[PDB]
Design a protein around this ligand. Structure first.
Ligand SMILES: Cc1ncc(C[n+]2csc(CCOP(=O)(O)OP(=O)(O)O)c2C)c(N)n1
Ligand SMILES: Cc1ncc(C[n+]2csc(CCOP(=O)(O)OP(=O)(O)O)c2C)c(N)n1
Ligand SMILES: [Ca+2]
Ligand SMILES: [Ca+2]
Ligand code: NA
Ligand code: NA
Lengths: 617, 617
């Protein structure tokens, strides 16, 4: 698939038009990364005007090839290709980085041509893997996926997780293009132009690796055209600032715009090398992506638990997820070699074609989910121990910037796991997920609440987190109980309540046990289950407090900062007559039995009862 | 260095004693991972009783070889070697996982023989790299560093970052042993027993890679004895549950103890294979680690700023760090290809031998710092953009479980960076660091406070975080101002103050500007700079509020959850007459000029003034 002579020259001309646009935009803004754009200009021309198939007036079309700009600071050249393709007006490029424009400093999905935000390096290939996995195994469509990475970027371990994933899953519809321009931000990239080492690394991770001159349209086209039996890495030897005389291949230019006078001079030089004005039209795709049903997802039946039966919420999650897979053909499940502990294995057993084993690689797992959710093709649920979602916080952070709809279930929360000790204990997961701006944080306290959290999460936009627990605890809700995001439940009350005790998961059950102890001493307490920690039901909390002498006690299997107690305090601070006492975990824990650790860390029934007795007196 | 016939058999006997101890301990506990111990028994015997050099009665001795158990769930066999070596009493092994014991489910540094906690897979090799870098380049000592990893564990990208680091820095004093036992937790590891692929991956990342039969003491000893010119990977083909008949090489046994009856039978079988009772003594090390000065670290002079001069706190950090490097020969600086933006380049210029370029690999950077701080050999300061510390949250979490003394400086906080947009904006870093139990969170508002934060951090135990900013802001403190952890500063006050406004960094300066605006309308406000967000100066905040009609307004360049406003609210909730109003960033931002974004997100001078006017009225 070698371009003919006219097309070849038109591709070279296109590359130079892209350089000019990148320089013009960044000089107009007074910030940005023209030298990072210029190393990629021939790559971008060949991708957008020779290799890819897409609808230039409908960038989000489900039939289109996908492009992911992993080196997101080259955003101006992404904008430039979409102007060249006729989607964006050329004049709009000059509004790069303005508060009045959507051509922001790094790509974001408010742009029709951007599926995932990038800017935190090393994440784009994982998203691309999810898109390619979806294309091959779910859509079974003809679209291909292309991802452009920098060489400095290849220092990120997340890249190598994605490399390994793509070869395990035989993603022969995925191409990674590595812009080996020798330089990072503040020094040369470690391997510089040792092209052979990059080739060996890619081959060792199972990819077909082709070294090219990244400024040769000819060599680029030959590499893209080769038969593809594996994921393919095009390892492109380039120069940073290519085409900018005196800047090409030099340090001290990363993220530095050309000054006005210099841009004018350089642009005239580049423009003089352009042989024809006639632009290339993109070739349209084969329209073989299937229709996908986006109707509200409804469980096929009510929960079928029995009040008083004991089940851990981790197990209820797996049961509910498997049931959800009968509610929608769009549900997919991902897990990081923990399916026997999170109980996502139950979904795998019933719907194996929609389970993705991600292995021990949580960063990549989140990125796969993000990629699978793009263009609304699937509804992903990822699971591992909640503690290990800390390993993926930047991916989760970027998922919110990507306006992604993913669902994450983290098990084994808190000290109540017992003997494994703190390395496995999630004690900061509420803090982390609450800080994610698009998040909904579910903390189901029994199996019924867990099933309803799964159903609600499936239908809720944004980053949904479900915190599950290891201990078996009693079912306390009837199967017809109606749950909503942002609505708490009062699970014990009387006209004589002296404190409102807010607990969740294991501490809700400890609070109910404390209530039984206290009733023997003629002390009644109101017990409230938040259901969602974010958004928090401020109204029910305050109404409860006002019925209980203004007194609130929050008790949580989590550290003090960023959790339930701080959420509650922040919601009610300043309200007349309201007081809040907080019980949480004050330091790194240790191994012991679950009940022993709840006692040691001051969040068990006897600690709750003592706090209540002290409040009354 | 092949063991003679008696020693060879003694090593085999030792391996079998280690198997027995691992089974006994986990059966006694009723939990743990004997099959993960048993694959490693010959490796552990050869390391501890042939290859390593260490003082068996002084595991923390600075002259000793280091061992890192990256696959930390094999803790029972680590405990077993230290019993075999005579440091632990054999009987204590039976108290594994008890709340009354320190032999916890995964290793932790309350154990003399543990430097870094493990249990979150994929982190140990990075810590080992820091130990080896320290041994070679700082201590210039003869000790070597050994790290045992699982094969499932090799799916983590952090491992490959460490691999790449070790070859860049020529860590020929580092050995990684890969326990290729075919199986993970819930399925086979992806590559199973494809030993050649592991070899190719390690070689491609610059290591000398040797495939061995991991149950052959002979082959293990030959591999350890080979000349070392590069970091060395011993790629050991093993079987999970080796030596446990009917369990060896089987699925469904990860993290499952043998029941009592079965343990008795298996242990008798293993014991029958032991030919001699005579234990091997460990060989002691060459005592060539240098003395290190642990005196309090004092800057050689007061800060030398001038009130009213403009400097960004990011630049003040670099200046202060370089000065700190003249205060102590122990200070080291690490940075992830951002030294020209964080200004750690200033330290590199003055103290290049103590600067470690970590490249674009934040997870590994944190682990390197943790390893360098072990045994108090250095005082590390790591820097990058604060947003990118989210990429290393699990490493930071584990650092606190490791009781590590590291210092982290994250620049470019908040929307005030302007045009790069949200991918680069730290808006959740206060939430994240506040949740880390051993943390001190410094948020210096000018260059003087920044210099004093650096000095204090150097002398403070735990995870110290310093949040720096991009905008140039005025110096407001005199050079002799005395700063302490947990002590705030009132930077503007009058007898007629009507609100206490708490700001930090850019929002402190916006609050001072608001005060100047408001004074024109005869409205005075008290302005308070927290200095440390954790611990928070509750007393000064409350005393200030009580002088200002009980009214507090907090304003921060951070999301609402987990930041300054929630810290303050949580501290003062329920105090009679106190009210708290909060201004923060309510959603994912976008590109624009710094001042435009502060306005858009409601945290600039005019937003503060409007909030104040509303509180009074
Ligand atoms: C996770 C992360 N860490 C650090 C940065 C800061 N950063 C932005 S661009 C860059 C250099 C990128 O170099 P490379 O990948 O070689 O791309 P090039 O611009 O040379 O094409 C750095 C370190 C980032 N954006 N993301
Ligand atoms: C970051 C992280 N993710 C997931 C886990 C859960 N986990 C504990 S052990 C294990 C399997 C480890 O297998 P491998 O590395 O092959 O070690 P082996 O026990 O086979 O020697 C898993 C997935 C963990 N501890 N850490
Ligand atoms: Ca580069
Ligand atoms: Ca294994
Ligand atoms: Na959802
Ligand atoms: Na410190």
């Amino acid at each position: 698939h070698k371009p003919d002579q006219q097309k070849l020259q038109a591709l070279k001309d296109t590359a130079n038009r892209l350089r000019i646009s990148s320089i013009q935009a960044t000089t107009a803004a007074g910030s940005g990364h023209p030298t990072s754009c210029c190393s990629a200009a021939e790559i971008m021309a060949v991708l957008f005007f020779h290799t890819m198939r897409y609808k230039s007036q409908d960038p989000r079309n489900p039939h289109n090839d996908r492009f992911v700009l992993s080196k997101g600071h080259a955003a101006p050249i992404l904008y430039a290709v979409w102007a060249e393709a006729g989607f964006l007006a050329e004049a709009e490029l000059l509004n790069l980085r303005k508060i009045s424009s959507d051509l922001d400093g790094h790509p974001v999905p408010k742009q029709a041509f951007t599926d995932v935000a990038t800017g935190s390096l090393g994440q784009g290939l994982g998203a691309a893997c999810g898109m390619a996995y979806t294309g091959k195994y779910f859509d079974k469509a003809s679209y291909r996926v292309y991802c452009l990475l920098g060489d400095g970027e290849l220092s990120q371990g997340s890249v190598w997780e994605a490399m390994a994933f793509a070869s395990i899953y035989k993603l022969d519809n995925l191409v990674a293009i590595l812009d080996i321009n020798r330089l990072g931000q503040s020094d040369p990239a470690p391997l510089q132009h040792q092209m052979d080492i990059y080739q060996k690394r890619c081959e060792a991770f199972g990819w077909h690796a082709i070294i090219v001159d990244g400024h040769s349209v000819e060599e680029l086209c030959k590499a893209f055209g080769q038969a593809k039996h594996q994921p393919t890495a095009i390892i492109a030897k380039t120069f940073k600032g290519r085409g900018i005389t005196g800047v090409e291949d030099k340090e001290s230019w990363h993220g530095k715009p050309l000054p006005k006078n210099m841009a004018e001079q350089i642009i005239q030089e580049i423009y003089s090398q352009i042989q024809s004005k006639k632009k290339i039209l993109a070739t349209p795709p084969q329209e073989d992506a299937p229709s996908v049903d986006i109707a509200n997802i409804r469980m096929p039946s009510l929960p079928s638990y029995k009040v008083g039966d004991k089940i851990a919420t981790r197990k209820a999650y797996g049961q509910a997820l498997a049931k959800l897979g009968h509610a929608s053909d769009r549900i997919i499940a991902l897990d990081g070699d923990t399916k026997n502990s999170t109980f996502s294995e139950i979904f795998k057993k019933e719907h194996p074609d929609r389970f993705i084993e991600c292995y021990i690689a949580e960063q990549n797992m989140v990125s796969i989910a993000v990629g699978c959710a793009t263009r609304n093709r699937t509804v992903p649920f990822c699971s591992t121990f909640a503690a290990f979602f800390t390993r993926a916080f930047d991916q989760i952070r970027m998922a919110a910037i990507s306006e992604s709809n993913i669902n994450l279930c983290g098990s084994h929360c808190g000290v109540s796991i017992g003997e494994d000790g703190p390395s496995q204990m999630a004690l900061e997961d509420l803090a982390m997920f609450r800080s994610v701006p698009t998040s909904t944080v579910f903390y189901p306290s029994d199996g019924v609440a867990t099933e309803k959290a799964v159903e609600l999460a499936a239908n809720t936009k944004g980053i949904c987190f479900i915190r599950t627990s290891r201990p078996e605890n009693a079912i306390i809700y009837n199967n017809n109980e109606d749950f909503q995001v942002g609505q708490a439940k009062v699970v014990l009350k009387s006209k004589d309540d002296q404190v409102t005790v807010i607990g969740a998961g294991v501490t809700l059950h400890e609070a109910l046990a404390a209530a039984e102890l206290l009733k023997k001493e003629k002390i009644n307490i109101r017990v409230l289950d938040p259901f969602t920690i974010k958004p928090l039901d401020r109204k029910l909390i305050l109404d409860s407090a006002r019925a209980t002498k203004g007194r609130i006690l929050t008790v949580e299997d989590h550290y003090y900062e960023g959790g339930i107690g701080e959420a509650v305090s922040s919601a009610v601070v300043g309200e007349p007559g309201i007081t809040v006492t907080h019980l949480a975990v004050n330091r790194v824990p240790r191994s012991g039995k679950p009940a022993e650790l709840l006692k040691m860390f001051g969040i068990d029934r006897d600690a709750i009862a003592q706090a209540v007795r002290g409040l009354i007196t």
